[PDB]
Amino acid sequence: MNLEILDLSILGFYSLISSNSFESIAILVATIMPVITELWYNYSQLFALLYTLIYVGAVVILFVFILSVINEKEEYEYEYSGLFILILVLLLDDLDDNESNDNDYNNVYITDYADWFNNYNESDLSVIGNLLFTEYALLLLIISFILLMSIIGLILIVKKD
Amino acid sequence: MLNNLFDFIEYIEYWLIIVAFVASVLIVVAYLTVAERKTMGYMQRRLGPNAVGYYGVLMAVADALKLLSKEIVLPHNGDIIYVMSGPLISLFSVLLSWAVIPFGPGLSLLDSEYSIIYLLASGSIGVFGTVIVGWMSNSKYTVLATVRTTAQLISYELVLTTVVFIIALIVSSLNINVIIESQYNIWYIIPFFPLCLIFFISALAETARPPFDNVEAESELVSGHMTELSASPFVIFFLSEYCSMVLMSTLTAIFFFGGYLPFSNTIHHLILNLFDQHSIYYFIIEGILLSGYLAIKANFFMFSFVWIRAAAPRLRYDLLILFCWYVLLPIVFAIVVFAPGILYCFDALPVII
Amino acid sequence: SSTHTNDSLNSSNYVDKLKDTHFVFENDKLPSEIPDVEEVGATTAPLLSAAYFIGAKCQDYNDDFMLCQKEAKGNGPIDCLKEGRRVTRCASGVLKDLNTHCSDEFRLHWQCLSFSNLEYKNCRKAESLLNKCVFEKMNLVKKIPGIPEDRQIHLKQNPVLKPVALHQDSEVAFKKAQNENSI
Amino acid sequence: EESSESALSKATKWYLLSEIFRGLYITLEMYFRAPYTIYYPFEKGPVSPRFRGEH
Amino acid sequence: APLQQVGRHGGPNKCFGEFQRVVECMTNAKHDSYEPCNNLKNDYLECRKHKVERYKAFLMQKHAEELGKDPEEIGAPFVRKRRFLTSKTLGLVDGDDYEIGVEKI
Amino acid sequence: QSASTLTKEDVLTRSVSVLRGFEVKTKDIDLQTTFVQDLGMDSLDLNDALVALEEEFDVVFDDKTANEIKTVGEVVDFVLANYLPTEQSINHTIR
Amino acid sequence: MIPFEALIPYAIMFAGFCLGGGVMNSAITADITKRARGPNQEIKRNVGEDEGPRNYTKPRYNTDQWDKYFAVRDLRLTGSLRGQSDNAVAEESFKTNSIQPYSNTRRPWVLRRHIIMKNSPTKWARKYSSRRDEREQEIKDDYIRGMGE
Amino acid sequence: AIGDYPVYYKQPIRWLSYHAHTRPHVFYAIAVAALGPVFMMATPLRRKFLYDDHEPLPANGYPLPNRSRDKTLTGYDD
Amino acid sequence: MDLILLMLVAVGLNIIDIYIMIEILIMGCTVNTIYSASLDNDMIGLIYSLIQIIIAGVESAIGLSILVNYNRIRNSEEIE
Ligand SMILES: CCCCCCCCCCCCCCCCCC(=O)OC[C@H](COP(=O)(O)OCCN)OC(=O)CCCCCCCCCCCCCCCCC
Ligand SMILES: CCCCCCCCCCCC(=O)OC[C@H](COP(=O)(O)OCC[N+](C)(C)C)OC(=O)CCCCCCCCCCC
Ligand SMILES: CCCCCCCCCCCC(=O)OC[C@H](COP(=O)(O)OCC[N+](C)(C)C)OC(=O)CCCCCCCCCCC
């Protein structure tokens, strides 16, 4: 039983019924956690950890803004929905989870063959840094330039002075 | 039975290893609460808890059992999601951070080339679980404490992350065990004495410990985010906060005092030469010895957590933000440029081996 | 490196569950037209212990097998089967000679590697005895290419990095040779 | 310009937390002194013949 | 010419050679049109997705069903649980069906 | 959005209904209808009506106007000239 | 005057670490050594009389891909991921006991099930538009048509 | 003019002192950071007076001999 | 269910809820990049994934500051 399917089923239910802004900042965290875990267990543990290191800091800053802008509006308001229309919507959605229509690509299993030629064996992050700091160093230096612009941009927007 | 009984232990052996791992960490956390009051008591010329259990050894048990026997305060029985989700996120975060702590060579539940990132990433989730208590709450002291938690997180997160990255840069690895074994000939306290202070200052701010206890400031916000918490939700938050103190004390011993490496190589060999290596008793003693070295260094920093609480007054958090952004960040980013330049000048760029 | 791939065992069985991994066997032997050869039966610790003696004995055959791979131009695994069989036999010859000439010295060294995370720096003493025994009986010298002979790390008198734990058998066997050979 | 200490002298006391470490040392001295606590009810604090208690 | 398809250890990966032979063909001055390099393009795309090879396996499985062939009699044996890659399955002389250790290497 | 949608006929109509729920001498209320004479309100009844007409239209009479008000038409004039919709949150308008 | 009562909780905390390390170092090392003795339970548990002293294998750390290939290769020779053998020649069963993992290559569940994360112009095209799969089916059909030549 | 603000291009030394007395968090962070590139500029001195750079690691795969295959190699045949 | 734009009901009714949708939508692109790069054993895709994460975090900050100042403008009297 792939229990990640159940997790996304609950998350989709709570995204349809979410009312206030605090629930939305919880839908975000309830989305990154399935992403981080599935990356950890299937494809990339490096990027599972990079997601946690960067998105959490963004989440708390996002949460602190909710405190300064919460404006009483959706606590006392009413929503109608209907339990039957919610579950029927989620049932129809769950029916079609085939993002791709290449049946052979989705059904036939493949393998790779290992070789011993790579005797200098290092992590993916060392190769990523090796290329990023040598061949795509321009991409890194532009990213540094964009980060500098954000620093100036945030000040010229928020600072009253 | 016999054969089925014997190989069922083999089927359950690693679970007991984890249970023993969990038990060992909880014993230190339980008796850190006792040790803090004993240490503060004698520094304050009192005794501290000595009436609950023989010489006070059951004080931690009494505090947990009494709090676990208290009514939980909440508007409704179905409102457990409100004041329990926060404590659990905080507790699960710090406990998962212990998976990468090696008590000896290879004696960590999780070993990977990105153990450093996992350590920083796991603890950042605990910060999120703390702010969840002020979830549109009508308690103004809980709300006021949530604002201060975010302000402290912004202060220490950059400095603590960058300091650990400099240590990882000196060894060119993000594996915690490799960083410990890289300190055979030198403990990083000597080359990076400024960074050890900054790491400990960041640890005090991360754990909301005095002089950075602006979150749970009793004289300001009665109990901070805990003012509405009673019984089990209060224990879990209290347990996780003292688990974080043990974790950051153990990380101070790992990043700067060689982790589990012996204080004296001569004495370490002398003690281990009494036991035959072909007997299982050698590896028990070695496990006790290596963890003892880690325990001694971590005990000193757990002592230092209590020591700074009993000597220094509290600093306002708006001053903490200026201190971290105007003083600590410029110094740490200077060393992140200083250190690679020194190593390149002497042709000593690190590699993993 | 602990990256999950599709060519070997992954970190845990949750990775297998997500990938629906099937660990597949093939009961067919190599075709009868291809000549047979006995595979090398040594595990990781003996092979690492014997790595520099296989290099000093099979250097011509190792290079010839690798040079065949370059000249194969993509048709590698097929066109170098004959060269590969020479490499396997030569490597087995070294392991055979170790177990008949330097058996105790050889088994001492790779039992230390198993005891010491398979790090060469942790087992210098047993390695020195094995190097001395192999050189006398097989005329094989460990050489690290690209550096002067007197800057080889395994011959360093006062290494900076040393094992925290001492292999008791290596300590005993090192003392015995000290008092009996270098009088 | 009218200070008595050099820039490095004031920065060494500042960066290395000179007075903070002194306060810790003073606190550590108390750790090795005799505490004041008496064990009530096995021991009683001093009383005087003028003491006012139960009638 | 920037590097593409770099393996996790810094060298060329499995499909770099296919890509390299495509670039050499397309940029060779002896070619009037790009028709000679069409088979090299399919080979590179087959190296990544194996779509035609998966399609062939689809035909073989389907063709075996219609002739009543047993999937377990014509396929390859497999084990789904890593703990049960036992010495008996591996064929060792003193093999056993007891589970293997995968908890800590 | 932030502008009035009031007409003189609606404000008069809502004013009459709110004044009908009180104990007035006559139910026939128009613009010229005075509070003291036609409806018969003393000092306290008049200010009960003014606050009742405040709640209906979400307006607040100033002290100077309230003390000097005589007729029903004066109230309708005041509501039309001073009514503003209440400001909404930053999300109600742009979303 | 060293207050011994204040130092008691530190002694228990010290013994807390030693409990974890003493158990983990010995229990794990013993299990690795036990499973390296042979391919069945009667050799792992029982100790032969003619056997020598027990040499222990310590837990491994700081591994890479080569150590994963080594671990599988050791399993095919000894039935253990850290088995021990210095025989110059393998058994006959080693020639045909290779393990090849075959796995699906599908996108993560969160990509194809999240209510918001699964919606994009190219994802809708891949899921609802047959333009892409019509072209790629022509390539597969050419493979069987061209067999005769 | 007892405590005026120095002009950097007129009194460089006094300008350095002002910031080292009033803004230590700026003066000394820069001073530490300057020691990075300065040591990198002293690297040529080390290559001539202390010791040379090490030989590069064999991290480019198996070292293939730069020659043709030996066509007279025999031994360990089928 | 996608073609009838069911995602328009899953997005909350605050401006910040639109910000979260944008982050989730971009995060879908990065997960697809990581998945393809890992299958191909290609580090260029992982370099792309790392760039997307850093850039997506930049616009999150720039958009937040605009929303922060927008709220300040409403609370402008500040007679205190
Ligand atoms: C250690 C476990 C921590 C979580 C345990 C509590 C379980 C509750 C749900 C957790 C997340 C599941 C998905 C929910 C996404 C957010 C939607 C939401 O609004 O929260 C649901 C919660 C229930 O409120 P309810 O009364 O049922 O609905 C409103 C009725 N007008 O309304 C609330 O506002 C309460 C939310 C409390 C704070 C939760 C913060 C999010 C924590 C997520 C961590 C785990 C990540 C998600 C894993 C599951 C994925 C489905
Ligand atoms: C290059 C080498 C780096 C050295 C590494 C260490 C860096 C430390 C920087 C300290 C600067 C400072 O204390 O800053 C002071 C700031 C702000 O003070 P201010 O408002 O500017 O007033 C002071 C300026 N005067 C004097 C020039 C006018 O806040 C504080 O009081 C911070 C107090 C931190 C105490 C934490 C306790 C830690 C205990 C550790 C036990 C193991
Ligand atoms: C070894 C590693 C641990 C300690 C590391 C840091 C220690 C302080 C360094 C800065 C000192 C400084 O800046 O010195 C400045 C001052 C004194 O100078 P002054 O005011 O001009 O003196 C006036 C003129 N005299 C020189 C004639 C006296 O010294 C101190 O207050 C030293 C206090 C140290 C006592 C406590 C030691 C134990 C501390 C706790 C350790 C866990």
Residues with CB under 6 A from ligand 3: D 12-13, 16, 18, 21-22, 24-25
Method used to obtain the model = cryo-EM
Exposed/middle/buried for G10, CB within 10 Å: 0-12, 13-18, 19+?
buried
* DSSP state letter for G106: P
The answer, yes or no, to whether the previous bond of D41 is cis (omega within 30 of 0) is yes
Ligand 3 centroid to Cα of residue D21, in Å, is: 7
Q: What are the phi and psi torsion angles at B101 (to 5°)?
A: -80, 115
Q: Which of F10, F28, F38, F42 is catalytic?
A: F42
Q: Which of G6, G16, G55 sits opposite B27 (nearest CB)?
A: G16
G100-102 β-sheet, strand order: E78-79, C22-24, G100-102
Q: What is the DSSP string of H11-70?
A: -HHHHHHHHHHH-HHHHHHHHHHHHHHHHHHTHHHHHHHT-PPPPPP--SSS---SSPPP
Supply C10's token pair: 């992954």
Supply B224's token pair: 């901070």
Distances (CA, A) of H58 to A119, C67, C145, E10, H55: 9, 17, 10, 14, 9
User: Does the beta carbon of D7 sit less than 6 angstroms from any atom of ligand 2?
Assistant: no
Q: Find out whether C41 and G87 touch, Cβ atoms under 8 Å.
A: yes
Interatomic CA distance for residues B165 and D22, integer angstroms: 31
Q: What is the DSSP string of E14-53?
A: TTHHHHHHHHHHHT-TT-SSSGGGHHHHHHHHHHHH-HHH
Q: Kindly identify the ligand whose nearest atom is closest to the C-alpha of D28.
A: 3
CB contact under 8 A, G103 and C22: yes
Inter-axis angle of helices H24-41 and H12-22, to 10 degrees?
A: 120
Q: What are the phi and psi torsion angles at C2 (to 5°)?
A: -125, 25
Nearest to E10 by CA among I49, H62, I43: I43
Ligand 2 centroid to Cα of residue C114, in Å, is: 49
For ligand 1, atom 5: residue with the closest CA: B85
Interatomic CA distance for residues B321 and B155, integer angstroms: 5
Spatial neighbors of F12 by CB under 8 A, at least 6 apart, are F30, F31, F72, F76
Q: Which residues of chain G neighbour B105 with C-beta distances below 8 Å? A: 58-59, 61
Spatial neighbors of F22 by CB under 8 A, at least 6 apart, are F39, F41, F45, F48, F49, F52
Q: Kindly identify the ligand whose nearest atom is closest to the C-alpha of D24.
A: 3
Q: Kindly identify the ligand whose nearest atom is closest to the C-alpha of A26.
A: 1
CB contact under 8 A, B331 and H28: yes
Spatial neighbors of F70 by CB under 8 A, at least 6 apart, are F34, F35, F36
Distance of residue C143 Cα from the nearest chain B Cα, in angstroms: 19
* DSSP state letter for B225: G
Q: Find out whether A11 and G114 touch, Cβ atoms under 8 Å.
A: yes
Ligand 2 centroid to Cα of residue D14, in Å, is: 6
Q: Find out whether B107 and B18 touch, Cβ atoms under 8 Å.
A: no
CB contact under 8 A, B7 and E104: no
Q: Number of residue pairs across A and G with CB atoms under 8 Å?
A: 84
Give just the sign of the alpha carbon dihedral H11, H13, H15, H18: negative
Supply G140's token pair: 């597969």
Find, in chain I, the residue whose alpha carbon is nearest to that of E12: I42
> Which SS3 state, helix, strand or coil, does residue A88 take?
helix
Nearest to A89 by CA among I9, E37, I49: I9
CB contact under 8 A, I18 and F90: no
Interatomic CA distance for residues B51 and B59, integer angstroms: 8
Supply C46's token pair: 């003996």
Long-range contacts from G140-145, C-beta under 8 angstroms, 24+ separation: G140/A104, G140/E51, G140/E52, G140/E55, G143/E52, G143/E55, G143/E56, G144/E59
Q: Where are the beta strands (DSSP E) in G10-134?
A: 100-102
I touches E (3+ CB pairs < 8 Å)? yes
This structure's resolution (angstroms)?
2.9
Beta partners for residue F71, in sequence order: F34
Strands E78-79 and G100-102: unpaired
CB contact under 8 A, G40 and E51: no
Cα angle at A38 between A33 and A41, to 5 degrees? Answer: 125
Interatomic CA distance for residues I44 and E6, integer angstroms: 7
Nearest to B262 by CA among H49, C164, C141, H47: C164
Supply B324's token pair: 């971290």
Q: Which of B185, B261, B286 sits opposite C160 (nearest CB)?
A: B185
User: Does the beta carbon of B159 sit less than 6 angstroms from any atom of ligand 1?
Assistant: no
Interatomic CA distance for residues B155 and B159, integer angstroms: 7
User: Does the beta carbon of B80 sit less than 6 angstroms from any atom of ligand 1?
Assistant: no
Q: Find out whether C24 and G101 touch, Cβ atoms under 8 Å.
A: yes
CB contact under 8 A, A31 and G133: no
Residue keyed to tokens 């004039």? F77
Q: Where are the beta strands (DSSP E) in F17-69?
A: none
Q: Which residues of chain C neighbour B112 with C-beta distances below 8 Å? A: 2
Interatomic CA distance for residues G16 and H18, integer angstroms: 54
Nearest to G101 by CA among C7, E102, A108: C7
Ligand 2 centroid to Cα of residue F50, in Å, is: 64
Distance of residue B313 Cα from the nearest chain E Cα, in angstroms: 47
For ligand 2, atom 36: residue with the closest CA: B201
**Cβ neighbours around D12 below 10 Å, total:** 14
Nearest to B230 by CA among B87, B125, B37: B87
Let me know if F77 is a catalytic residue: no
Cα angle at B191 between B186 and B197, to 5 degrees? Answer: 115
Find, in chain A, the residue whose alpha carbon is nearest to that of G122: A99
Interatomic CA distance for residues A133 and A124, integer angstroms: 14
Interatomic CA distance for residues F60 and I66, integer angstroms: 35
